Enzyme design. Structure first.
Site, PDB file in Angstrom:
ATOM      1  N   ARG A   1      -0.172  -5.067  -5.850  1.00 47.40           N
ATOM      2  CA  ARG A   1      -0.218  -6.358  -5.173  1.00 47.40           C
ATOM      3  C   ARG A   1      -1.300  -6.434  -4.076  1.00 47.40           C
ATOM      4  O   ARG A   1      -1.275  -7.342  -3.235  1.00 47.40           O
ATOM      5  CB  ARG A   1       1.176  -6.674  -4.605  1.00 47.40           C
ATOM      6  CG  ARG A   1       2.174  -7.076  -5.682  1.00 47.40           C
ATOM      7  CD  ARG A   1       1.974  -8.520  -6.112  1.00 47.40           C
ATOM      8  NE  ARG A   1       2.333  -9.420  -5.012  1.00 47.40           N
ATOM      9  CZ  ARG A   1       3.520  -9.990  -4.822  1.00 47.40           C
ATOM     10  NH1 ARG A   1       4.517  -9.817  -5.681  1.00 47.40           N
ATOM     11  NH2 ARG A   1       3.708 -10.757  -3.755  1.00 47.40           N
ATOM     12  N   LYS A   2      -2.245  -5.490  -4.103  1.00 42.93           N
ATOM     13  CA  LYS A   2      -3.426  -5.507  -3.237  1.00 42.93           C
ATOM     14  C   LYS A   2      -4.716  -5.250  -4.035  1.00 42.93           C
ATOM     15  O   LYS A   2      -5.575  -4.464  -3.626  1.00 42.93           O
ATOM     16  CB  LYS A   2      -3.239  -4.486  -2.105  1.00 42.93           C
ATOM     17  CG  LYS A   2      -2.213  -4.935  -1.066  1.00 42.93           C
ATOM     18  CD  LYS A   2      -2.739  -6.069  -0.198  1.00 42.93           C
ATOM     19  CE  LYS A   2      -1.612  -6.828   0.482  1.00 42.93           C
ATOM     20  NZ  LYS A   2      -0.919  -7.779  -0.430  1.00 42.93           N
TER      21      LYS A   2
ATOM     22  N   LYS B   1       0.803  -1.237   0.000  1.00 42.81           N
ATOM     23  CA  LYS B   1       0.000   0.000   0.000  1.00 42.81           C
ATOM     24  C   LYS B   1       0.832   1.281   0.000  1.00 42.81           C
ATOM     25  O   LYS B   1       0.391   2.295  -0.562  1.00 42.81           O
ATOM     26  CB  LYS B   1      -1.039   0.010   1.134  1.00 42.81           C
ATOM     27  CG  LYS B   1      -2.483   0.063   0.642  1.00 42.81           C
ATOM     28  CD  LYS B   1      -2.881  -1.118  -0.238  1.00 42.81           C
ATOM     29  CE  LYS B   1      -4.188  -0.859  -0.970  1.00 42.81           C
ATOM     30  NZ  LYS B   1      -3.990   0.010  -2.168  1.00 42.81           N
TER      31      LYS B   1
ATOM     32  N   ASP C   1       9.011  -6.843   5.008  1.00 39.67           N
ATOM     33  CA  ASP C   1       8.376  -7.472   3.861  1.00 39.67           C
ATOM     34  C   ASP C   1       8.421  -6.515   2.665  1.00 39.67           C
ATOM     35  O   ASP C   1       7.994  -5.381   2.787  1.00 39.67           O
ATOM     36  CB  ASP C   1       6.929  -7.781   4.252  1.00 39.67           C
ATOM     37  CG  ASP C   1       6.135  -8.412   3.146  1.00 39.67           C
ATOM     38  OD1 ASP C   1       6.644  -9.352   2.484  1.00 39.67           O
ATOM     39  OD2 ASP C   1       4.985  -7.970   2.924  1.00 39.67           O
TER      40      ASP C   1
ATOM     41  N   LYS D   1      -5.306   3.919 -19.498  1.00 41.12           N
ATOM     42  CA  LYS D   1      -5.186   2.547 -19.012  1.00 41.12           C
ATOM     43  C   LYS D   1      -6.560   2.105 -18.481  1.00 41.12           C
ATOM     44  O   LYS D   1      -6.957   2.453 -17.350  1.00 41.12           O
ATOM     45  CB  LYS D   1      -4.115   2.434 -17.920  1.00 41.12           C
ATOM     46  CG  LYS D   1      -2.669   2.464 -18.419  1.00 41.12           C
ATOM     47  CD  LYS D   1      -2.255   3.810 -18.985  1.00 41.12           C
ATOM     48  CE  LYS D   1      -0.749   3.930 -19.137  1.00 41.12           C
ATOM     49  NZ  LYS D   1      -0.375   5.146 -19.911  1.00 41.12           N
TER      50      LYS D   1
ATOM     51  N   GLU E   1       5.362   2.264 -11.596  1.00 38.59           N
ATOM     52  CA  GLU E   1       5.452   1.201 -10.598  1.00 38.59           C
ATOM     53  C   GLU E   1       6.401   1.639  -9.495  1.00 38.59           C
ATOM     54  O   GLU E   1       7.423   2.291  -9.762  1.00 38.59           O
ATOM     55  CB  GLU E   1       5.976  -0.111 -11.210  1.00 38.59           C
ATOM     56  CG  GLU E   1       5.325  -0.524 -12.519  1.00 38.59           C
ATOM     57  CD  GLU E   1       3.880  -0.980 -12.371  1.00 38.59           C
ATOM     58  OE1 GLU E   1       3.276  -0.840 -11.283  1.00 38.59           O
ATOM     59  OE2 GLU E   1       3.341  -1.508 -13.370  1.00 38.59           O
TER      60      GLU E   1
END
Ligand SMILES: CC[S@@+](CC[C@H](N)C(=O)O)C[C@H]1O[C@@H](n2cnc3c(N)ncnc32)[C@H](O)[C@@H]1O
Ligand SMILES: CC[S@@+](CC[C@H](N)C(=O)O)C[C@H]1O[C@@H](n2cnc3c(N)ncnc32)[C@H](O)[C@@H]1O
Ligand SMILES: CC[S@@+](CC[C@H](N)C(=O)O)C[C@H]1O[C@@H](n2cnc3c(N)ncnc32)[C@H](O)[C@@H]1O
Ligand SMILES: CC[S@@+](CC[C@H](N)C(=O)O)C[C@H]1O[C@@H](n2cnc3c(N)ncnc32)[C@H](O)[C@@H]1O
Ligand SMILES: [K+]
Ligand SMILES: [K+]
Ligand SMILES: [K+]
Ligand SMILES: [K+]
Ligand SMILES: [Mg+2]
Ligand SMILES: [Mg+2]
Ligand SMILES: [Mg+2]
Ligand SMILES: [Mg+2]
Ligand SMILES: [Mg+2]
Ligand SMILES: [Mg+2]
Ligand SMILES: [Mg+2]
Ligand SMILES: [Mg+2]
Lengths: 380, 380, 380, 380
Positions: free
Chosen positions: C249-250, C17, C243, C274, C42
């Site tokens: 990735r959420k 996040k 981590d 997009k 990204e």
């Protein structure tokens, strides 16, 4: 009465020299838009990677991808078969603004002439009458051997050549009342990256006949001269893939090849407020002015600075006994004739002009068309 | 008869010196497990980042995170309030094996004594009788001022001190038949990173009374000595956050502070096959052996190598007129008494021992308990 | 007739996040200056590191250091004692221009309404009448538990809290003619990063009394509800240090917590061309319009696109039997009432406005004051 | 009675899929030496760069340069003319040990069968009787179109093909009592990277005749089928150069192509203690066992976990009305027949075997020779 001295040089595709050229490409890009850009750009090169790290405060809008990739293209790394390619390498950027604590101590709210030195440090200039360009023959020849390789690579005479090269020249000298007189070339080393297909005997034959004999006057070569040509036997892997590069790791190649002295500061990636560059350039200018002015044959000049202080802390002249005047007398002539504050050196030597990428291979001194190589006429 | 000379030094937390120490921590870590490790480790430091880049071929299993973080802890960067923290910084690794083309040309299938030089290059050693440790007073004092700062930081005497520091010392010398005699300290510069809370007047008072007066003999200081203490006025931002660091960007601080000469090669992060280190260490050993042996008072020694060739290409001795023997006579004594092949230097100077992190701040020469500082008894 | 369903959410300092918020901070920064910026940013987070990687073509001048560091400050990572600090972390940038091959196929020389989809892909929208905001209770509660933690952290009620948190809520539901009716909370999980000094029993007591009881209506909690509070027992190490994080990735936390479906595309760091973002937002808008319009109680909407083609390739409606109208009838109502070309969606939903950082934690749907959450009045 | 559904797939050289394959190559490399390696390896790809970031605690000695470069070679990126080259790209590593706080909560001092889940989360398994492999036709066809491209690239039939590709398949289905029956292919999209020399008409002709007609049964294709072949018009720039890649950004391509549901967790780069992988694999196994056992025609299975807790927190079965048994009855059969603790799943599905790189392109499910695809015989 005779002795040996050795100096080296490296080619445009040597990994350290790639970084120096990139750092100065970035500097030039900023200066084109903002003459007062504050730039401290370090470059690191390894397999497939150019990293920019350091500090820049500038009004310029610079495309770092374009600047870096164009510099690498110019060098000749344009295919994965050569070990590095400007089209497909990684470019990473870790650039921040100049520290405000440095800015406030050095240049904020200061008159341009009275700008403080951007750092502490010591610097040396050197000149010798042994060549017309007032440089040591050992390093002049070493540079020229690398430039010849690049020429023959680029014109297709030796298409097996790649951009990464190193040379080294040992000259036998005679002493002459503190000056030095070159007698002969004692040893030459050449190592250059090459394609898989050419054999060692063809390379060594070409290096002797088309490179060395094209650069070094025959009067210096004889039956006793030693040749170490491709002495490792194989040099296919090269550029950053063979060996990591960093900005400011060729400081002796950049200057006098071991002659004179060095204060430790790198040149490339730095604007004029960094006295490592501006004051070393001025010190060369002083040294060359003393020799071309007929006051001595060989001379070393030291200067030093403190961060935030405009005037040098010390100035020293060492003439090796090659003047009728005392070193004290030469020091007083230098003090009367030069103003070595960075804010004055910038005016005298046009150090806001974007001409730095030109300096970043083949040495910063003894080269055509730089202000620090044009002697000042001295009053005394 | 008198002249000024200036040298500088930097502290353990100077960003360039952080990189040298890390590079040598990595070297030591490999040597502890594999005495024949081939190591060429460059370090880069910027805000929040340590990057390792270069070439290592070794049988050792090294935890790079642990080695890097422990080195930074030792230096004293252990909190974000100081600008850098070993616990929370980024450690990136871009290490590959040594090029097989280098390996085959240098050491594969070769007898240890007959290992080729790991690269071409030139190197200088220097010694002067002006101090017991045979080093220039200018750099000895500069180093000691940085070490005093670290001491007072670590014992809580001046808890406002941070690890990043620089010093510079200008000494007035007299000439003495080619040797040099220190007369007085002309100028001292000290800049050191500090916490927000201490004011400039308290810092400058402490720097004079607890640092300078604790290091420099009173006989060298007088009413005319110039002091530039915290000359920027503010130095809160420091370490890699203030200025990017790289391995091998303090090569003059590592050696002789501008005296003598330098061939250009960095020491840190390199095993003994890299003659930049082993041959420079041997050249110091030769220079110190000539002075401690009573053959001269001040001496410069040059050596050079070609990659893949075990014996040096050239050796030169310059005694500044401080010997009754000729330079040719000294050269012949050196040739009879030393074997400067890297595969022999390694034996003589114990260069597979993991003692390199010790060398990577406060200079490589004039220091306690290194083999290159113990004179060889000369036969002639 | 009853079943369990589980959804999760994460806090603003969860490493994934962090990356979503940074990617959208960068997007917003560009849109503030250039409404037509093409952005595909990204972010990657690990100990001491934020890396930006991707493609941006924009007329904006963006200070990436400032944007990244301000976002991390907002999250609460401001000291090395918390494991991450915006002041001293590394920020690396590997951003290039958008591929010209993409640009020519998608938007160059095209009318804004007739811009091609920026990529192929599939997307789903979902709505359920089980809450006023038309979202699943499981995920609404999970989000609210993380927001409560941030509130109590920021107001000093629980000063031992750190920014990295995760929650998970299992609800027992009853079936109701294809719709779902929440009956009770079956299980709650909370894991949150904490300082060294607080013990486990104090944390678990606070998590029950000040977090869960402050968020979840008492009517849903009973003697059988299961609580897994700090179930690992220790969570001092957290954020990117514990981590690695990455953008996108959420994607289930961002949408419907497992209910409905997902086409795979991430939202954050992407401009309106997009369709992963713009078309998913439009599909939510359609789903919420059908439910708030009284045409069904629960609905799933699929759309899909091809790169360079403006109109969707397919549209599908699944109502779970919760409408008197057929799915075909609903599809025809959707076709009459919506234009799902990206160049029209941008107008309807104001997708050039720099409001994206707001979306990047606590879910993109069921939130206050977004155009895709305001139902369209349907004609049929 | 009919509806459209669309799924996509990507090729082995798609930048996200490059990262998944690398992450699983690294996992396999560790498992070959240490079956109990704890691995959480994220990969990031951009022009000229592979970065590894994450956490690994293992007794294995892994050469990350070799593992990464061999994986990229296998994919087919072996020349700068293709946009990426395994020989010359940058490989950066930012790997640390697993957090001790995680280790102590999950697996230290615990019996293998009673190992806690490595994280919280939710997971779904799905199966459908519409194909023999129990997968949706839409995604099966999408995968097969990418595999056909790789085949024709590698055998020299279409030498203009490069490794980066995407496909998308829309099928028209009929409803059949909660099951689904494929009727026809409505739309196909193919985009594939290509060399400069081939024209668009030759590419589109080959894509129809040698790819689509070689993969899709003619019974599904008719005069109305829509073809979007190289719809952007140009796709020379590709791989990481065209678009950044990250691990775990193709989670729907990895699973069921939009059918069923997803809990959000990525598979690649994770050992068996990460229930995102092990529990999703077990849930597929349950779903496929129910369908192949004749208990239903189409089924969705949810499970969830808390970090440090071995047993799932919830299990749910949704059969779409395709069973004579109730969902409660199926749940009880699943509870009697499966043990969904990660320490038992590892035994049943052989999850310490280094077979994960095989899973990381063309989907993890419906593939030959994996334990989760072999039905369990059910007792009831
Ligand atoms: C000394 C080889 S490298 C420096 C040592 C290296 N870091 C190691 O790991 O051993 C320095 C330079 O020497 C040139 N070079 C590279 N490969 C070869 C080779 N195979 N033969 C001769 N010279 C070479 C290149 O300029 C290079 O930057
Ligand atoms: C000259 C400052 S910096 C070099 C210039 C800098 N790259 C720029 O961007 O201008 C070199 C070294 O000088 C010391 N330093 C850092 N900040 C200060 C400061 N505010 N005052 C005095 N010295 C400082 C540190 O050792 C540092 O590595
Ligand atoms: C599951 C721990 S981590 C994911 C696994 C990890 N990559 C590994 O190497 O095992 C995922 C998230 O879980 C939270 N977390 C981190 N440390 C702890 C801990 N000690 N206890 C509970 N939760 C924790 C954080 O949000 C973190 O991003
Ligand atoms: C949608 C192009 S890219 C995603 C958008 C991009 N980040 C941007 O900056 O606009 C996604 C994938 O689409 C494929 N692709 C790349 N270039 C082209 C192209 N020129 N035509 C068609 N498809 C392409 C590759 O797989 C790529 O990873
Ligand atoms: K190097
Ligand atoms: K610097
Ligand atoms: K992770
Ligand atoms: K992307
Ligand atoms: Mg070098
Ligand atoms: Mg300096
Ligand atoms: Mg420096
Ligand atoms: Mg060298
Ligand atoms: Mg994650
Ligand atoms: Mg997508
Ligand atoms: Mg992607
Ligand atoms: Mg997860």
């Amino acid at each position: 009465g005779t002795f040996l001295f050795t100096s080296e040089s490296v080619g445009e595709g040597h990994p350290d020299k790639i970084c120096d050229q990139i750092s100065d490409a970035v500097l030039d890009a900023h200066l084109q838009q903002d003459p007062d850009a504050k730039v401290a750009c370090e470059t690191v090169a390894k397999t497939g990677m150019i990293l920019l790290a350091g500090e820049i405060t500038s009004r310029a809008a610079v495309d770092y991808q374009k600047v870096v990739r164009e510099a690498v293209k110019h060098i000749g790394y344009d295919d994965s078969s050569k070990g590095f390619d400007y089209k497909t390498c990684n470019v990473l950027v870790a650039l921040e603004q100049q520290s405000p604590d440095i800015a406030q101590g050095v240049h904020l709210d200061r008159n341009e002439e009275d700008i403080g030195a951007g750092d502490q440090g010591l610097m040396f200039g050197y000149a010798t009458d042994e060549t017309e360009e007032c440089m040591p023959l050992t390093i002049v020849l070493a540079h020229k051997l690398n430039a010849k390789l690049a020429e023959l690579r680029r014109n297709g005479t030796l298409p097996w050549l790649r951009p990464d090269s190193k040379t080294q020249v040992t000259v036998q000298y005679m002493q002459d009342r503190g000056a030095v007189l070159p007698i002969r070339v004692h040893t030459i080393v050449i190592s250059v990256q090459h394609d898989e297909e050419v054999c060692l005997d063809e390379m060594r034959d070409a290096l002797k006949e088309k490179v060395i004999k094209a650069v070094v006057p025959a009067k210096y070569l004889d039956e006793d001269t030693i040749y170490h040509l491709q002495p490792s036997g194989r040099f296919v892997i090269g550029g950053p893939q063979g060996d990591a590069g960093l900005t400011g790791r060729k400081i002796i190649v950049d200057t006098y090849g071991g002659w004179g002295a060095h204060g430790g500061g790198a040149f490339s990636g730095k604007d004029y407020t960094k006295v490592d560059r501006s004051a070393a350039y001025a010190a060369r200018w002083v040294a060359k002015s003393l020799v071309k002015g007929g006051l001595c044959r060989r001379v070393l000049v030291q200067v030093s600075y403190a961060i935030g202080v405009s005037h040098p802390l010390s100035i020293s002249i060492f003439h090796y006994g090659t003047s009728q005047k005392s070193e004290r007398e030469l020091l007083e002539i230098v003090k009367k004739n030069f103003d070595l504050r960075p804010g004055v050196i910038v005016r005298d030597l046009d150090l806001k002009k974007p001409i730095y990428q030109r300096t970043a291979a083949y040495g910063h001194f003894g080269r055509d068309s730089f202000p620090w190589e044009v002697p000042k006429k001295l009053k005394y």
